[PDB]
UniProtKB/TrEMBL annotation:
Residues 21-76 form the Bromo domain. Disulfide bonds join C23-C61. This is Bromo domain-containing protein. The lineage of its organism: Eukaryota, Discoba, Euglenozoa, Kinetoplastea, Metakinetoplastina. It comes from the Eukaryota. The chain holds residues 5 to 123 of 660 of the full protein.
Length: 97
């Protein structure tokens, strides 16, 4: 497996998902930043693992808070926002940046 993205960029990418119960909370994002520092995400062109981790945290939010309401709507809204930042990062690396 060839390292496509450096740990520093993955940590900064996970950090950019931080915008100040809520679910996913700060401790869920701090765990992802920890995984990013240990090099969990730099080997996927499309950041497949990082996107899985986000979807899994969001599916966990839905299970515990219910599918309808403000908490589920915040979890789905967060997810759309995070996928946007993840894709813009990929688009920026491809466009040179």
């Amino acid at each position: 497996r060839q390292l496509l993205y450096p740990r520093e960029e993955m940590v900064s990418l996970v950090r950019s998902l931080d915008r100040p119960k809520v679910c996913p909370n700060r401790c869920d994002l701090a765990t992802a930043a920890d995984r990013a520092a240990k090099g969990a995400y730099g080997y996927d062109v499309q950041l497949t693992t990082l996107k899985e981790d986000i979807r899994l945290m969001v599916n966990n939010c839905i299970l515990f808070n219910g599918a309808e309401g403000a908490y589920a709507d915040a979890a789905r809204t967060f997810e759309k926002f995070a996928m946007g930042k993840i894709d813009a990062y990929i688009s920026q690396k491809v466009g040179g940046r």
